[PDB]
Amino acid sequence: GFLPKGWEVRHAPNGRPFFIDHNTKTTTWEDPR
């Protein structure tokens, strides 16, 4: 499904996806969906 408003996902150097919270200018390994 689509990420919540303000979020995106990218891949870290180690290849693991991380999620980016532009609403609070923070990131996390955990999927927010």
Binding site: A12, P13, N14, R16, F18, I20, D21, K25, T27, W29
Partner: peptide, 9 residues
């Protein structure tokens, strides 16, 4: 093994 911080985006 922490994620990249927001400054790295």
């Amino acid at each position: 093994e922490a994620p990249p911080s927001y400054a790295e985006v």
